[PDB]
Amino acid sequence: SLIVTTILEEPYVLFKKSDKPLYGNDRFEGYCIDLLRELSTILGFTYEIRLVEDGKYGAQDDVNGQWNGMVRELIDHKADLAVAPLAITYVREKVIDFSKPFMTLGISILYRKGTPIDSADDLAKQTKIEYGAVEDGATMTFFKKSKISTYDKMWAFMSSRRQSVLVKSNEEGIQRVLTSDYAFLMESTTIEFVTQRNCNLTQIGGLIDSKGYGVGTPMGSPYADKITIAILQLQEEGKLHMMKEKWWRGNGC
Amino acid sequence: SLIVTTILEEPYVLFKKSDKPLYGNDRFEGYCIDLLRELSTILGFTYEIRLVEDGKYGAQDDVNGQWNGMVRELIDHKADLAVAPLAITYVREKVIDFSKPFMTLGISILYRKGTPIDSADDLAKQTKIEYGAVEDGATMTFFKKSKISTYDKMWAFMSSRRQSVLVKSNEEGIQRVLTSDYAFLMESTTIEFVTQRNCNLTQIGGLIDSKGYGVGTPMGSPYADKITIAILQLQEEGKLHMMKEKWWC
Ligand SMILES: C=C(C)[C@H]1CN[C@H](C(=O)O)[C@H]1CC(=O)O
Ligand SMILES: C=C(C)[C@H]1CN[C@H](C(=O)O)[C@H]1CC(=O)O
Ligand SMILES: [Cl-]
Ligand code: NA
Ligand code: NA
């Protein structure tokens, strides 16, 4: 039996709606839960899903270098797999292993329709429209590390305003877009889910970078390569595409 | 130095043009050549580029189970890395290792603009317009194995006409599109290169699947993970994007 760490994030992992309390694995559904189920069938393991205690994905404390979130659970061998929209990044790959990607995406901008804002550069060169990202996530880290003029400028803006423009979650960022003059730097996969459900919102510009989500494992785990092969099987038979359609597809904007 | 196996395929790998003779690695240019140079810089290795003798990527013969191409070079430890638009696939991952993807893509359709054909389904339902793929590549293999009705039908059509509709190169497929009534099933990255240069051609429909190109290594090689890390660094600093813009109406 494997211990699988994960985190609530629509539509990847959600609590099933129910009149009565549910228990154990029965509590959860979503794209990542379907993925876990499919992987379990192919590779023949059982599992217990556990929400990560600190509610974090995994970032390094910039003073002591210690990790948190699902990444820390893996490093500490508290979990066997992390199954979530966990971006494969340079810093994380140095401390844990990942399967090859089950989904590909990039940072982009969530904003309202009908404005003159067409790119990151348009946001960077002003301050009236505030903008931000989830604190300490892969998106924020991209900006923190970027040497590109536009993105460095955006980092200077966000970091100096971290108290007011950085958010704790996608949900908070999305609500900020809906209720104030704010543009949210966020992952394109999640943007697509949002824009299918709110016709007044749109992605602005294209993808600013490229990354994949992968299943995390402790470094050296034999499951990283096994899951890669299972993911390739699922992709090549069209299941990953069906899985995405199931959890994303909206009724039109 | 590491031995790096590769293959000519525009704009990934080409012979550099010069008025004077060129030697060694200097003979080559392209996206993958730039990639290799950058990987070299980060990881601190020297290397020798060699074109794969049999001019194949890597497929398994369904009679004797023998592999060929760059995949075979890696299996036999004749090369340390394969750096090319080499698709990461289930069957290849069973026999060699791969870095994580430096490019992501999918099978799609290259055809002419201004036609009624809007999807694979539209091709499958007819026979007047021929269609095909590079023989024995990842695209053909996708169709050969698929259980999705539309793709299974397309495979049945292609296999019954393989002498006439399967081609030996992307170049041959493109020439087929240009000189006959033919739609070519090919990788979306390469389609983008072609359509930026041939204004009468276009991608039809979306991506039929999703895959990545990765650097291949013999199975168990320590370089697969090292190259993954270097690729992630290159991506995050915007270098892969710059390289794409450089090499890619
Ligand atoms: C839901 C959020 C906090 C996660 C999801 N993937 C990114 C990560 O793996 O860090 C984070 C989003 C982002 O940074 O835009
Ligand atoms: C250039 C061709 C022969 C290669 C490139 N990638 C695919 C591969 O890795 O097999 C092949 C193309 C294709 O199958 O459409
Ligand atoms: Cl349970
Ligand atoms: Na790792
Ligand atoms: Na492998």
A232–B146 CB contact, under 8 Å: no
Whether residues B90 and B66 fall in one domain: yes
Tell me which ligand sits closest to the C-alpha of residue A1: 3
Give the whole-angstrom CA distance, residue A173 versus residue A155.
Answer: 17
Give the whole-angstrom CA distance, residue B177 versus residue B112.
Answer: 8
| Under 8 Å between Cβ of A197 and A101 | no
H or E element that contains A38: helix A31-43
Q: Is B212 on the interface with A (CB under 8 A)?
A: yes
Whether residues A21 and A83 fall in one domain: yes
Whether residues A117 and A97 fall in one domain: no
Whether residues A151 and A176 fall in one domain: yes
What are the φ/ψ torsions at residue A9 (nearest 5 degrees)? -165, 110
- Written in H, E and C, the secondary structure of A113-133 is CCCCCCCHHHHHCCCCCEEEC
Burial A161-200 (b: 16+ CB within 10 A, else e): eeeebbbeebeebbebbeeeebbbbbbbbbbbbbbeebee
At B181 the three-state DSSP class reads coil
A window 12-71, beta carbon within 8 A of B: none
Distance from CA of B105 to the nearest CA of A (A): 10
Q: Choose the final residue of a domain: A210, A227, A242.
A: A210
| Under 8 Å between Cβ of B222 and A253 | no
Q: Is B232 on the interface with A (CB under 8 A)?
A: yes
| Under 8 Å between Cβ of A186 and A195 | no
The encoded tokens of residue A206 equal: 């294209």
Chain A residue nearest residue B229, CA to CA: A90
* Binding-site residues from annotation of A for L-glutamate: 85, 87, 92, 138-139, 187
Burial A93-118 (b: 16+ CB within 10 A, else e): bebbbbbbbbbbbbbbbbbbeeeebe
Which residue from A12, A170, A189 has its CB within 8 A of the most atoms of ligand 1, so it is best to mutate? A170
Pairing of strands A130-132, A182-187: parallel
> What separation in Å is there between the alpha carbon of A50 and the centre of ligand 3?
10
Q: Is A216 on the interface with B (CB under 8 A)?
A: no
The reply to whether B139 sits in an annotated binding site is yes
Whether residues A112 and A205 fall in one domain: yes
Give the whole-angstrom CA distance, residue B214 versus residue B82.
Answer: 9
Whether residues A53 and A171 fall in one domain: no
B150: CB partners within 8 A, 6+ apart: B120, B121, B124
What are the φ/ψ torsions at residue A216 (nearest 5 degrees)? -85, 145
Pairing of strands A81-82, B81-82: unpaired
Phi-psi region of B158 (alpha: psi -120 to 50; beta: other; left: phi over 0): alpha
Give the whole-angstrom CA distance, residue B62 versus residue B19.
Answer: 45
| Under 8 Å between Cβ of B81 and B2 | yes
Distance from CA of A65 to the nearest CA of B (A): 19
Whether residues B77 and B113 fall in one domain: no
Tell me which ligand sits closest to the C-alpha of residue B216: 5
Domain range for B228: 1-105+211-249
Give the whole-angstrom CA distance, residue B232 versus residue B225.
Answer: 11
Q: Is B220 on the interface with A (CB under 8 A)?
A: no
Give the whole-angstrom CA distance, residue A130 versus residue A66.
Answer: 31
User: Cα-Cα-Cα-Cα dihedral of B112, B118, B119, B123, to 10°?
Assistant: -60
Give the whole-angstrom CA distance, residue A95 versus residue A220.
Answer: 10
Burial A38-63 (b: 16+ CB within 10 A, else e): bbeeeeebebebebbeeebbbbbeee
A94–B229 CB contact, under 8 Å: yes
Chain A residue nearest residue B222, CA to CA: A220
Residue A158: burial class (beta carbons within 10 Å; 0-12, 13-18, 19+): buried
Q: What is the resolution of this structure in A?
A: 1.6
Tell me which ligand sits closest to the C-alpha of residue B82: 2
Whether residues A163 and A231 fall in one domain: no
Whether residues A186 and A216 fall in one domain: no
Decide whether any atom of ligand 2 lies within 6 Å of the B9 Cβ. yes
Phi-psi region of A58 (alpha: psi -120 to 50; beta: other; left: phi over 0): left
> What separation in Å is there between the alpha carbon of B245 and the centre of ligand 4?
29
Which of B88, B209, B236 lies closest to A100 in CB terms?
B88
Whether residues A170 and A220 fall in one domain: no
Chain B residue nearest residue A238, CA to CA: B209
Whether residues B233 and B197 fall in one domain: no
Whether residues A203 and A221 fall in one domain: no
Query: Could you give the residue ranges of the DSSP H alpha helices within A126-198?
Result: 138-145, 149-160, 162-165, 170-179, 188-195
Overall domain count for chain B: 2
Decide whether any atom of ligand 1 lies within 6 Å of the A231 Cβ. no
A235–B145 CB contact, under 8 Å: no
E strands along chain B, which residues?
A: 2-6, 14-15, 28-29, 47-51, 81-82, 96-98, 103-105, 107-112, 130-132, 182-187, 201-204, 211-213, 216-218
Half-sphere CA count of B12, side-chain side, radius 13 A: 21
Q: Is A236 on the interface with B (CB under 8 A)?
A: yes
| Under 8 Å between Cβ of A4 and A50 | yes
Distance from CA of A195 to the nearest CA of B (A): 20
Q: Which residues of A touch B148 (CB under 8 A)?
A: 238
Query: Which residue has the least CA distance to atom 5 on ligand 2?
Result: B85
At A108 the three-state DSSP class reads strand
Decide whether any atom of ligand 2 lies within 6 Å of the B132 Cβ. no
A236–B89 CB contact, under 8 Å: yes
What CATH number has the domain bearing residue A91? 3.40.190.10
Experimental technique, in short, is: X-ray
